[PDB]
Amino acid sequence: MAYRIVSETGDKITVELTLANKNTHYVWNGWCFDIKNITFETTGKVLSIKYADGGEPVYNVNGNLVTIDLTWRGIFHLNTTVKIIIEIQKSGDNPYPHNFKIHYLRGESIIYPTIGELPASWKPGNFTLSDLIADPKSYYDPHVKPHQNGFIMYNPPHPTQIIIGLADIDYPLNLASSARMWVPNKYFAMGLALAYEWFKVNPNFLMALAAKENWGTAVTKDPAFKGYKVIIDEEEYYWPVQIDHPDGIFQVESGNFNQIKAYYPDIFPDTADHDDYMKVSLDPNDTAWITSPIVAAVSLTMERELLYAAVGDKYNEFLRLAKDPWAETEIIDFGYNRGVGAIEALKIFSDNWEKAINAEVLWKEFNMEGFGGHVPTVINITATMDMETERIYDANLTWDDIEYFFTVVRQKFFRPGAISDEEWNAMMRDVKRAYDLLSQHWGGDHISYRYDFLTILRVAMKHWPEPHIPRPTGDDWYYHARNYNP
């Protein structure tokens, strides 16, 4: 930050720390800053730490390190400035305040595993086909490799492919005899893939979640479950989805929607509406079909973010000490069904750490059954879709479909100022190039969703404001996250 020695007289040193938000107009990940604390080092004796405009923040000294807390003052909107004055009595080899480190109210060691990248040879504007594909052999390799990923894809099955295992379910889903995973339309798969590349969220998990919450991504041969007749490979199936539900296929309540709307200003514009973004229709042209998955993912992501803000490094520590290989998925799903308050009540990272890290099956030992066996159902369907090597979902995409998709993305997400008109148009030109380039493999009439859409997405994301995942901020966020004691 910006500090300055105001005066050194006698043995006391007076330093002015200017903490401020510089931005006047909205910028990416700079609309509002939330500061948990400000740490600095000194060997001298701290006399007093006060605000310049009256009052003093709460601080405490542990050896060489001093931690300053802003408490209720820690909210920095646009064009906000707070000056802090520090007095120190000169002592030791290094008495002057130094090594200032502002700790934002966010997971300092949060983990978002990279799925894959474009070749370093890739350039904006005019690129070649070899600048899109690192290795055509693996890029078109059909062979399906099994994986055991839950909510977050730490270890991707393939860096450039989309493995959505449309597996058959041999165990009860919503009290059914059996079930079969299928995708309603391709635009929803585009949404799943966008959430996958952007937020590193396993699409199979969103499939399981939607299927459990509203039969959104699953059908069954069970006669009791009567609904829309879906034909797959000369086989009649019943789709008991409630397509008229305003909470969408992910069952997102309006309260949660508005809350995560306030949490992420960089993602959700002010004109956003619950029913518009979530409630889908039988018509695949509905915008919601694309917006519904991402939003859900965001919500899920939010929960994770929250934990990273409350537990910090310890979170990651748990990940290497937990015997249950599905623990994170369990916690996140359970928190999605019940609420973050349920997670806070479980107190895994607090009072009940030992039982948590020692239990081989986390969701059984904590009696977190959810609503009608929610957690185990979601986990099981996710794992089953992960193990599927026989049949993987694929789709054909025309250019107008891509245009439609990105137009929808521009219309429903982001905020004026994040991406101006120029480089967005240029972005669409680069996506045009990419499309026409790797469509020559299929005959220039279509591109493969599974094989190509990750590449398309990455080409499109070469222009997206980085860091790609913005920090959840704002008023509500600060105090809902700071009060969080899991």
The closest of 168, 201, 202, 200 to 182, measured between CA atoms, is 168
Closer Cβ to a second copy, 62 or 71, answer by number: 71
> Which partner, a second copy, Co ion, none, binds residue 351 by CB below 5 to 8 Å per kind?
Co ion
Q: Do residues 238 and 229 lie in contact, with contact meaning Cβ atoms separated by under 8 Å? A: yes
Strands 396-397 and 447-448, bridge-based pairing: antiparallel
> Which partner, Co ion, a second copy, none, binds residue 90 by CB below 5 to 8 Å per kind?
none
Out of 12, 90, 432, 480, the only residue in the binding site for a second copy (CB under 8 A) is: 480
Residues linked to residue 229 through DSSP beta bridges, in sequence order: 238
By CB under 5 A, what part of segment 334-363 binds Co ion? 350-351
Binding residues for Co ion, rule CB under 5 A, total 6
Interacting span for a second copy (CB under 8 A) from 85-93, 266-274, 307-315, 396-404:
266-274
DSSP reduced 3-state for 444: coil
> Which partner, a second copy, Co ion, none, binds residue 270 by CB below 5 to 8 Å per kind?
a second copy
Site track 302-331 with a second copy (rule: CB under 8 A), x = hit: ------------------------------
Positive or negative torsion for Cα 162, 249, 209, 107? positive
Q: Do residues 437 and 147 lie in contact, with contact meaning Cβ atoms separated by under 8 Å? A: no
Measure the CA–CA gap between 227 and 258, rounded to whole angstroms.
31
**Does residue 485 belong to the site contacting a second copy (CB under 8 A)?**
yes
The closest of 159, 245, 262 to 210, measured between CA atoms, is 245
Closer Cβ to Co ion, 65 or 345, answer by number: 345
Out of 100, 104, 353, 479, the only residue in the binding site for a second copy (CB under 8 A) is: 479
**Does residue 74 belong to the site contacting a second copy (CB under 8 A)?**
yes
The closest of 458, 479, 463 to 114, measured between CA atoms, is 458
**Does residue 287 belong to the site contacting Co ion (CB under 5 A)?**
no
Helices (H), 374-448: 374-387, 399-412, 421-437
Closer Cβ to a second copy, 353 or 479, answer by number: 479
Measure the CA–CA gap between 276 and 118, rounded to whole angstroms.
34
> Which partner, Co ion, a second copy, none, binds residue 482 by CB below 5 to 8 Å per kind?
a second copy
Q: Do residues 277 and 408 lie in contact, with contact meaning Cβ atoms separated by under 8 Å? A: no
DSSP reduced 3-state for 49: strand
Give the nearest distance from C-beta 237 to Co ion in angstroms. Answer: 26
Q: What is the residue type of 12?
A: K
Measure the CA–CA gap between 403 and 60, rounded to whole angstroms.
55
Give the nearest distance from C-beta 462 to Co ion in angstroms. Answer: 6
Neighbours of 287 (CB within 10 A): 17
Interacting span for Co ion (CB under 5 A) from 86-94, 158-166, 240-248, 458-466:
458-466
First and final CA of the chain: distance in angstroms? 31
Closer Cβ to Co ion, 3 or 51, answer by number: 51
By CB under 8 A, what part of segment 244-263 binds a second copy? 254-255, 258
Out of 6, 47, 58, 426, the only residue in the binding site for a second copy (CB under 8 A) is: 58
Neighbours of 347 (CB within 10 A): 13
Out of 273, 275, 423, 475, the only residue in the binding site for Co ion (CB under 5 A) is: 475
Strands 2-9 and 179-181, bridge-based pairing: unpaired
**Does residue 338 belong to the site contacting a second copy (CB under 8 A)?**
no
**Does residue 81 belong to the site contacting a second copy (CB under 8 A)?**
no
Out of 73, 221, 314, 415, the only residue in the binding site for a second copy (CB under 8 A) is: 73
Closer Cβ to a second copy, 235 or 351, answer by number: 351
Buried b (16+ CB within 10 A) or exposed e, 117-141: ebeeebeeeebeeebbbbeeeebee
Give the nearest distance from C-beta 271 to a second copy in angstroms. Answer: 8
Residues linked to residue 12 through DSSP beta bridges, in sequence order: 9, 89
Q: In this structure, what DSSP letter does residue 71 have?
A: G
Interacting span for a second copy (CB under 8 A) from 70-78, 134-142, 226-234, 312-320:
70-78
Closer Cβ to a second copy, 54 or 125, answer by number: 54
Query: Which residues contribute to the site for Co ion (CB under 5 A)?
Result: 350-351, 445, 461, 475-476
Query: Which residues contribute to the site for a second copy (CB under 8 A)?
Result: 53-54, 58, 71-75, 254-255, 258, 270-271, 273, 475-476, 478-480, 482-483, 485
